[PDB]
Design a protein around this motif. Structure first.
Motif, mmCIF file in Angstrom:
data_model
loop_
_atom_site.group_PDB
_atom_site.id
_atom_site.type_symbol
_atom_site.label_atom_id
_atom_site.label_comp_id
_atom_site.label_asym_id
_atom_site.label_seq_id
_atom_site.Cartn_x
_atom_site.Cartn_y
_atom_site.Cartn_z
ATOM 1 N N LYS A 40 0.851 -1.183 0.000
ATOM 2 C CA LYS A 40 0.000 0.000 0.000
ATOM 3 C C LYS A 40 0.889 1.236 0.000
ATOM 4 O O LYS A 40 1.784 1.360 0.843
ATOM 5 C CB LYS A 40 -0.937 0.000 1.210
ATOM 6 C CG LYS A 40 -1.766 1.275 1.389
ATOM 7 C CD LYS A 40 -2.819 1.428 0.299
ATOM 8 C CE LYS A 40 -3.470 2.804 0.333
ATOM 9 N NZ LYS A 40 -3.533 3.425 -1.019
ATOM 10 N N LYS A 41 0.639 2.141 -0.942
ATOM 11 C CA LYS A 41 1.416 3.363 -1.100
ATOM 12 C C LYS A 41 0.596 4.533 -0.573
ATOM 13 O O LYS A 41 -0.459 4.852 -1.133
ATOM 14 C CB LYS A 41 1.774 3.591 -2.568
ATOM 15 C CG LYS A 41 2.627 2.497 -3.192
ATOM 16 C CD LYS A 41 3.091 2.899 -4.580
ATOM 17 C CE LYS A 41 3.924 1.813 -5.247
ATOM 18 N NZ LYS A 41 5.206 1.540 -4.542
ATOM 19 N N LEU A 42 1.070 5.166 0.491
ATOM 20 C CA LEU A 42 0.420 6.379 0.977
ATOM 21 C C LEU A 42 0.843 7.557 0.107
ATOM 22 O O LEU A 42 2.043 7.853 0.033
ATOM 23 C CB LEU A 42 0.776 6.648 2.436
ATOM 24 C CG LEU A 42 0.832 5.454 3.391
ATOM 25 C CD1 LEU A 42 1.212 5.932 4.781
ATOM 26 C CD2 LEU A 42 -0.496 4.713 3.422
ATOM 27 N N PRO A 43 -0.085 8.258 -0.568
ATOM 28 C CA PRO A 43 0.337 9.388 -1.410
ATOM 29 C C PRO A 43 0.969 10.516 -0.610
ATOM 30 O O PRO A 43 0.925 10.516 0.624
ATOM 31 C CB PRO A 43 -0.970 9.835 -2.079
ATOM 32 C CG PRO A 43 -1.848 8.639 -2.028
ATOM 33 C CD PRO A 43 -1.525 7.981 -0.729
ATOM 34 N N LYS A 44 1.556 11.483 -1.309
ATOM 35 C CA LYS A 44 2.233 12.592 -0.655
ATOM 36 C C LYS A 44 1.216 13.565 -0.074
ATOM 37 O O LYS A 44 0.226 13.914 -0.723
ATOM 38 C CB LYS A 44 3.146 13.313 -1.649
ATOM 39 C CG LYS A 44 3.998 14.441 -1.047
ATOM 40 C CD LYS A 44 4.460 15.464 -2.087
ATOM 41 C CE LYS A 44 3.295 16.174 -2.769
ATOM 42 N NZ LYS A 44 3.670 17.531 -3.252
ATOM 43 N N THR A 57 -0.864 13.118 2.367
ATOM 44 C CA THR A 57 -2.076 12.512 2.899
ATOM 45 C C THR A 57 -1.846 12.064 4.337
ATOM 46 O O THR A 57 -0.765 11.572 4.675
ATOM 47 C CB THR A 57 -2.506 11.315 2.050
ATOM 48 O OG1 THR A 57 -1.500 10.295 2.110
ATOM 49 C CG2 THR A 57 -2.723 11.726 0.603
ATOM 50 N N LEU A 108 8.967 4.942 3.308
ATOM 51 C CA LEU A 108 7.955 4.001 2.839
ATOM 52 C C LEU A 108 8.410 3.183 1.632
ATOM 53 O O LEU A 108 8.334 1.952 1.661
ATOM 54 C CB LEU A 108 6.662 4.756 2.512
ATOM 55 C CG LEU A 108 6.028 5.534 3.672
ATOM 56 C CD1 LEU A 108 4.740 6.225 3.239
ATOM 57 C CD2 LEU A 108 5.769 4.621 4.865
ATOM 58 N N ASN A 109 8.883 3.838 0.571
ATOM 59 C CA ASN A 109 9.131 3.171 -0.700
ATOM 60 C C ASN A 109 10.542 3.442 -1.199
ATOM 61 O O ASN A 109 11.234 4.345 -0.727
ATOM 62 C CB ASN A 109 8.130 3.616 -1.770
ATOM 63 C CG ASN A 109 6.707 3.624 -1.264
ATOM 64 O OD1 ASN A 109 6.347 4.416 -0.395
ATOM 65 N ND2 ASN A 109 5.891 2.728 -1.796
ATOM 66 N N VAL A 121 2.263 12.101 5.689
ATOM 67 C CA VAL A 121 3.220 11.688 4.667
ATOM 68 C C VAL A 121 3.959 12.918 4.158
ATOM 69 O O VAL A 121 3.337 13.914 3.769
ATOM 70 C CB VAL A 121 2.511 10.950 3.521
ATOM 71 C CG1 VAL A 121 3.515 10.529 2.457
ATOM 72 C CG2 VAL A 121 1.761 9.732 4.050
ATOM 73 N N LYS A 158 -6.701 11.221 1.582
ATOM 74 C CA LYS A 158 -7.196 11.829 2.811
ATOM 75 C C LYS A 158 -6.237 12.937 3.218
ATOM 76 O O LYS A 158 -5.075 12.668 3.539
ATOM 77 C CB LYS A 158 -7.324 10.783 3.922
ATOM 78 C CG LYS A 158 -7.938 11.295 5.221
ATOM 79 C CD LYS A 158 -9.431 11.017 5.288
ATOM 80 C CE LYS A 158 -9.995 11.372 6.655
ATOM 81 N NZ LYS A 158 -9.824 10.267 7.640
ATOM 82 N N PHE A 159 -6.730 14.178 3.215
ATOM 83 C CA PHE A 159 -5.928 15.343 3.560
ATOM 84 C C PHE A 159 -6.320 15.992 4.876
ATOM 85 O O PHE A 159 -5.486 16.679 5.474
ATOM 86 C CB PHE A 159 -6.024 16.405 2.453
ATOM 87 C CG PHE A 159 -5.628 15.906 1.094
ATOM 88 C CD1 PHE A 159 -4.349 15.434 0.861
ATOM 89 C CD2 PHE A 159 -6.537 15.906 0.051
ATOM 90 C CE1 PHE A 159 -3.983 14.974 -0.388
ATOM 91 C CE2 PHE A 159 -6.177 15.446 -1.200
ATOM 92 C CZ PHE A 159 -4.898 14.979 -1.419
ATOM 93 N N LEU A 210 9.526 9.231 0.095
ATOM 94 C CA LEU A 210 8.445 9.647 0.976
ATOM 95 C C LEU A 210 8.507 8.883 2.291
ATOM 96 O O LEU A 210 8.936 7.723 2.346
ATOM 97 C CB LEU A 210 7.069 9.435 0.326
ATOM 98 C CG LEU A 210 6.770 10.207 -0.961
ATOM 99 C CD1 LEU A 210 5.380 9.862 -1.468
ATOM 100 C CD2 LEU A 210 6.888 11.706 -0.728
#
Ligand SMILES: [Mg+2]
Lengths: 244, 84, 91, 208, 59, 233, 266, 199
Positions: C8-12, C14, H139-140, H152, H27-28, H145
């Motif tokens: 699962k990749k959490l977007p920037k 978020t 994370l990746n 994040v 989700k912001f 990030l």
């Protein structure tokens, strides 16, 4: 809504205040003005939360371990400690020190009698508590008494929040060692909250905050105020606070 | 769009499907067989995997759906039938 | 290495919860995985084979309203426009 | 005067059980603050005082849960009320004059009586040497096994006396008897022996 | 992938449809039945989703 | 269900039983129920006024009431189709309750989404005990929340200190910002003072989140390695 | 006070039980120091300190959540007159009608208890046992919270005939007189039945109708008002509102019982 | 009257919100108000809502859409996560002015996330805190990030990635790192873009 507790003989205390320690104006500052101030601030801070339903002592026990609500803790601590202080200086509910308390002081303080212990507490308050603070005589789980001092609003019950060491200035290497062992004790616990068990209880409480003495005793001469507090305590409450 | 079923005699799945997890021994055997297929039988490369199998099957070779129950229990509440 | 579907990749920018770094989050995301929905007239798009072709299968079969998700009015206009495009030599 | 049902739960399915659990809950509720730290009456015994035929095993398990919770309260802080309520529901070998531990064991139709004394690992069977009486090595090892479980082989002298059955049965009877005799010399090792399987009679026997 | 395309285009079912002749009334009856069964399946899936959510929440 | 007769006429049936001699002793409830008659009317009652906003239901404006033209420039000379339809259902429907605050509230949490994250308690305490003067935002026995902003806005408009909704809303918003800044500063300074005076904290929010993430990630590690092994074959 | 406790020696530290007693002594004296809590809702009090019927206001009923009715999609149109309106997708109950009906039902309960009748508190939802038991105990009544056996009233001989019965004086004092088998086997029928969840207890309501037992109930937006003698329009799915109304009724019954005892003691 | 009290009731105080409770998009910021119940009221399943929440729920926080529905269930979720993120931001100390002097729906500055002011620094017993350090997780394998305390962020590196990154690959998120938050800014849509550095 946290409300200022009603005090026995409130009319007499308004008229004169606690005899031989405070005048009426000083007692207004220490209790009628400061306790109302603290209670109102706590109500504003904790209204609309769970903590409105808990007493200040249970509030501070709950809130001791969370960094971001220290303000609430501080208020709660004061709201507790001040009342404790007041109760050991109320004129009455002459009261005499009990045999059990004298025995414990004699046994706890390496055979020293109670009055030289009073002078030692005066020395401790003069030395370590620079400015606002609290002084306590407390008993640990070993049935041993000892003298504790808290800077600003600190609690005797929970040793992480004792606030007995002033890091604004330097610290003795022994104090640093005490801090490190204290932090290790905190960290050892498996609880998520990080709580630890501390069965310390305050037998005596003295208010070194400027609200207590500044108007009656000036910027200096705080040790005079502490001596007056200790000499003329209400010993019924102090004796009751001890468990047998 | 939302589709509303009529008042039904029951709410039940004819064949509830359960997620049985494939046995570890079987997949380890498959990996060993692929190892000997590519490198060769008793090849030095994947011999370590053999050890795992020798343990994994040593004791034994191989080492539930409640949907109908909950549906029957809850149907009277969620069906949304008219009052009476 | 971890297959991409298994990660699962959490977007920037978020926010997230600890649950996000879990296979349950991936399964939940899998579970809950244009112009004609913008108030336009599909009949006007009858000499525009590309946009009509967006709404047909590889073989040219018009997609059901369950697939397109259009309104009944616009679904009927889209079907009519696609058939007209078929008739006039386009598409 | 007025006739009314006795119990507040009279209109429930099992009023007796409900009322009794109500009393137990009341006591468990008044003294909820007390910290914590012997069989109970049987199902028929509680049926007699409760719902009788209406009594249900889940109700009995609930009763036992409450009773165990109340009993599990720390004894030093219990009082007369809790004990009074709970009372309604309540239902060594040594060596001889010669320092010998005497044990009797059985296996199949064989019986063995063994005298175990402190010594140097000497063994006699029916007044005969072990190797003369027991020709099979496996039987000798079976007799040894309880001694070597407690690592006391070579520290005791054994006088075994068998009768009945055959060689293996007599040997395993000697084994079980030796374990039972060894338990006397050091009771703390009993569990160890019990975990080795030598302190349990082999109840298997020939069947028709 | 080719077989997936075939089943998405309903070519297999279509071929068996054209094999024999079916009277238009029967065709309409079958079409109504199939549509009703599809809608009933959608509603049943919705109800099962509600059941599973309620079970998760403790209802 | 039909309106049930037997439930409310128990007294009459019991009286018949007693007078006939079928029942010898009066039930204990007989005298009480006789003294307190059950309500035996179950009628749908018309509603002519919406309490929330005061809109009057069941009023038609006659042709004579308009001696002038409407917005389109047309005089009303005859009733139109909607006017000639009986509206009894409007009387007998329960009226929808609408409040002005419901709009501003929706605005506030749109303007400040993170204010939603601050927990709210819906347990009412005692509503009647509220004694608030809204010349100032902070109330004893109340938290400081957006609803305080809407309440101050309504107080401002009621006293006509400001005329338009937007102006009072903005003024209350700025008071809210000042107060929340003061509270944030108290929290930060209190934590700094605690660390200044030797207070030791076992766990912090960042470390708590890291711990929970670690548990979840360890379970996810096991599941992913197992699933990769499963999928490979 | 605390028998069978062995204190520790002065040389040794406190024991766990000594620490517990020390902390109890601290709690009963000093833990409550600093402020007195006012205007804060404590759930247990709703059971133990219910207000009198005359002291109830609309604000107090709204604070308990009594006004919150069922969803507008589950409306029973026969409950139209009790509804003040709809708000946020649910129907709001008119709390003035609730106050009137509740006062009437409290008077009924007080009268029945003052006459020495049998009052039965039936409520079968999850967490209603505590309030039901307390109401029954303070009204000298009876309660059911596990399950209502169908036929409990219309088939009393086959259900409740085996359980024991008791003769009592005007002052509710046991007489310990021996009852004859015929007396023990008679039906003892409730004089008043109060139901907290009438929607899930249709059997009890129908049995009371058949057996001519006047009944009270909390009538939510989706409940039938005419199935009960003395309806109380209010929310039946919230435990706070149910406990508030039940405590009011129980206090009325207790007042009736106290009046009865006072007259018998004069 | 009853209408006024209902208008001022806490249930009315919660704004009308109807967004999907289970949301898989980006989700912001918070989208549902968090409802809190005291432990005493939790013991009795009282949350101040219309109906009792099931006893299975042990958390003291939830986010809800409907007081009641046709299915006779309260449409809710037992989640109170977002507050912690907000509170965790307060632990970071990084500051982010519209809070100083017809209806517009734009997010006004920081929409309640942080009401701090930029010009202040943290004193510590060691001394003045020059730069704030918080732990996070990369994370990746990509800029890179990091999940840091509920948000994040894109981490600004310092020469090369540590070799641990290359060795671990996609299992990188398993190991914690220590970052220093260079800057925090708020985008128009409400996203919080923070730049941090892996020490
Ligand atoms: Mg209901």
């Amino acid at each position: 809504i946290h409300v200022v507790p009603k005090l026995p003989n409130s009319k007499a205390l308004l008229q004169n205040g606690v005899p031989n320690i405070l005048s009426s104006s000083g007692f207004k500052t220490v209790w009628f003005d400061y306790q109302r101030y603290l209670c109102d601030k706590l109500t504003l801070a904790t209204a609309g939360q769970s903590l409105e339903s808990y007493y200040p002592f249970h509030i501070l026990l709950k809130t001791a371990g969370n960094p971001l609500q220290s303000n609430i803790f501080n208020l709660a601590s004061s709201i507790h400690n001040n009342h404790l202080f007041v109760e050991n200086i109320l004129p009455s509910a002459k009261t005499e020190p009990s045999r059990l308390f004298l025995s414990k002081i004699k046994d706890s303080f390496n055979g020293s009698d109670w009055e030289v212990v009073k002078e030692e507490m005066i020395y401790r308050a003069e030395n370590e508590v620079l400015g606002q603070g609290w002084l306590f005589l407390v008993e640990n789980n070993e049935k041993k008494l000892f003298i504790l001092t808290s800077n600003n609003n600190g609690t005797p019950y929970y040793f992480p929040r004792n606030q007995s060491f002033d890091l604004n200035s330097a610290i003795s290497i022994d104090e640093f060692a005490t801090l490190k062992q204290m932090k290790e004790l905190i960290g050892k616990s498996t609880k998520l909250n990080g709580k630890v068990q501390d069965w310390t209880m305050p037998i005596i409480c003295v208010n070194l905050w400027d609200h207590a003495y500044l108007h009656d005793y000036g910027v200096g001469n705080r040790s005079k105020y502490v001596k007056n507090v200790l000499d003329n305590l209400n010993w019924s409450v102090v004796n009751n606070r001890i468990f047998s | 769009p939302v589709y509303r079923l009529p008042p039904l005699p029951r709410l039940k799945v004819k064949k509830p499907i359960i997620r049985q997890e494939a046995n570890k021994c079987l997949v380890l055997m498959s990996n060993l067989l692929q190892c000997w297929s590519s490198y060769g039988h008793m090849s030095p490369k994947c011999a370590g995997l053999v050890t795992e199998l020798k343990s994994c099957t040593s004791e034994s070779a191989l080492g539930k759906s409640n949907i109908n129950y909950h549906a029957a229990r809850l149907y009277d509440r969620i069906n949304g039938k008219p009052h009476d | 290495k971890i297959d991409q579907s298994l990660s699962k990749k959490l977007p920037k920018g978020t926010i997230y919860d600890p649950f996000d770094f879990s296979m349950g989050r991936i399964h939940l995301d899998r579970k809950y995985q244009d112009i004609m929905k913008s108030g336009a007239n599909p009949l006007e798009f009858y000499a525009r084979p590309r946009i009509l072709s967006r709404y047909v299968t590889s073989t040219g079969r018009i997609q059901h309203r369950d697939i397109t998700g259009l309104s009944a009015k616009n679904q009927r206009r889209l079907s009519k426009a696609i058939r007209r495009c078929q008739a006039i030599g386009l598409m | 005067r007025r006739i009314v049902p006795k119990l507040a739960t009279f209109y429930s399915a099992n009023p007796n059980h409900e009322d009794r659990i109500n009393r137990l809950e009341r006591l468990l509720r008044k003294y909820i603050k007390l910290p914590s730290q012997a069989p109970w009456i049987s199902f028929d015994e509680y049926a007699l005082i409760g719902g009788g035929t209406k009594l249900k095993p889940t109700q009995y398990t609930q009763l036992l849960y409450m009773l165990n919770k109340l009993h599990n309260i720390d004894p030093q802080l219990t009082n007369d009320e809790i004990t009074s309520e709970l009372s309604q529901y309540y239902k060594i070998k040594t060596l001889d004059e010669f320092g010998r531990s005497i044990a009797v064991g059985k296996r199949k139709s064989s019986t063995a009586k063994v005298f175990v004394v402190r010594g140097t690992g000497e063994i006699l069977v029916n007044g005969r040497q072990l190797n003369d009486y027991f020709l099979k090595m496996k039987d000798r090892e079976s007799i040894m096994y309880p001694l070597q479980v407690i690592e006391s082989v070579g520290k005791y002298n054994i006088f075994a006396t068998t009768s009945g059955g055959g060689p293996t049965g007599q040997a395993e009877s000697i084994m079980h008897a030796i374990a039972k005799a060894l338990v006397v010399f050091n009771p703390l090792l009993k569990s160890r022996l019990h975990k080795a399987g030598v302190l349990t009679r082999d109840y298997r026997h020939v069947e028709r | 992938r080719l077989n997936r395309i075939m089943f998405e285009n309903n070519i297999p079912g279509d071929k068996r449809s054209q094999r024999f002749y079916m009277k238009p009334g029967k065709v309409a009856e079958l079409k109504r039945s199939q549509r009703h069964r599809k809608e009933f399946m959608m509603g049943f899936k919705r109800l099962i989703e509600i059941v599973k959510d309620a079970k998760r929440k403790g209802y | 269900m039909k309106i049930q007769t037997n439930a409310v006429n128990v007294l009459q049936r019991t009286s018949a039983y007693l007078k006939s001699g079928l029942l010898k002793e009066t039930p204990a409830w007989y005298n009480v129920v006789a003294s307190i008659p059950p309500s035996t009317k179950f009628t749908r009652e018309p509603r002519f006024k919406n309490p929330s906003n005061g809109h009057i239901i069941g009023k038609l404006v006659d042709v004579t009431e308009q001696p002038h033209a409407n917005n389109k420039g047309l005089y009303k000379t005859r009733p139109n189709s909607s006017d000639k339809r009986v509206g009894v259902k409007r009387l007998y429907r329960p009226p929808k309750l609408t409040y002005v605050e419901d709009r501003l509230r929706s605005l506030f949490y749109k303007q400040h989404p993170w204010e939603l994250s601050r927990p709210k308690i819906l347990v009412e305490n005692e509503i009647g005990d509220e004694n608030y003067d809204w010349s100032h935002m902070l109330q004893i026995g109340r938290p400081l929340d957006g609803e305080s902003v809407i309440q101050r806005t309504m107080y401002l408009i009621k006293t006509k200190q400001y005329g338009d909704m937007v102006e009072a809303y903005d003024h209350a918003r700025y008071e809210f910002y000042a107060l929340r800044m003061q509270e944030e500063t108290e929290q930060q300074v209190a934590l700094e003072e605690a660390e200044m005076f030797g207070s030791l904290f076992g766990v912090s929010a960042i470390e708590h989140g890291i711990q929970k993430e670690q548990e979840v990630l360890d379970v996810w590690e096991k599941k992913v390695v197992e699933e990769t092994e499963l999928m490979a074959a | 006070p605390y028998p069978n406790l062995i204190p520790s020696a002065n040389d040794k530290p406190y024991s766990s039980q000594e620490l517990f007693l020390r902390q109890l002594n601290h709690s009963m004296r000093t833990a409550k120091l600093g402020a007195t809590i006012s205007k804060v809702y404590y759930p247990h009090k709703d059971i133990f300190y219910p207000p009198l019927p005359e002291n109830i206001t609309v604000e107090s009923l709204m604070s308990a959540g009594v006004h919150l009715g069922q969803s507008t999609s589950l409306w029973r149109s026969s409950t139209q007159s009790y509804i003040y309106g709809e708000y946020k997708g649910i129907h709001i109950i008119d709390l003035n009608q609730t106050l009137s009906y509740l006062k009437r039902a409290a008077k009924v309960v007080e009268g029945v208890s003052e006459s020495g009748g049998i009052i039965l508190f039936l409520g079968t939802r999850q967490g209603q046992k505590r309030g039901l038991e307390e109401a029954a105990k303070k009204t000298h009544g009876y309660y059911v919270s596990t399950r209502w056996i169908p036929g409990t009233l219309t088939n009393s001989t086959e259900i409740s005939g085996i359980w024991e019965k008791q003769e009592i004086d005007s002052n509710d004092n046991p007489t310990e007189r021996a009852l004859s088998p015929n007396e023990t086997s008679k039906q003892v029928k409730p004089d008043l039945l109060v139901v907290l969840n009438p929607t899930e207890n249709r059997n009890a309501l129908l049995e009371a109708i058949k057996s001519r037992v006047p009944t009270i109930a909390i009538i939510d937006t989706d409940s039938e008002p005419s199935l009960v003698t003395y309806p109380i329009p209010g929310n039946d799915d919230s435990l706070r509102s149910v406990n508030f109304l039940l405590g009011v009724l129980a206090r009325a019954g207790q007042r009736g019982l106290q009046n009865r005892l006072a007259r018998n003691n004069e | 009257t009853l209408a006024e009290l209902l208008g001022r009731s806490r249930i009315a105080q919660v704004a009308n919100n109807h967004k999907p409770l289970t949301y898989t998009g980006k989700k912001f910021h918070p989208t549902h108000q968090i409802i809190e119940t005291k432990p005493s009221t939790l013991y009795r399943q009282e949350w101040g809502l219309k109906s009792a929440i099931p006893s299975k729920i042990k958390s003291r926080y939830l986010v809800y859409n409907d007081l009641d529905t046709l299915e006779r269930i309260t449409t809710f979720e037992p989640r109170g996560g977002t507050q912690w993120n907000r509170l965790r931001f307060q632990e970071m100390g990084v500051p982010i002015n519209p809070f100083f002097k017809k209806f517009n729906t734009e997010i006004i500055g920081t929409g309640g996330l942080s009401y701090s002011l930029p010009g202040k620094l943290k004193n510590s017993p060691n001394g003045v805190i020059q730069r704030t350090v918080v732990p996070g997780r990369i994370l990746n394998v990509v800029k890179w990030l990091a999940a840091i305390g509920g948000f994040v962020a894109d981490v600004v590196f310092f020469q090369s990635p540590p070799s641990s990154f290359n060795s671990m690959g996609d299992f990188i998120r398993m190991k914690t790192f220590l970052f220093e938050i260079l800057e925090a800014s708020m985008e128009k849509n409400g996203s919080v873009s923070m730049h941090a550095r892996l020490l």
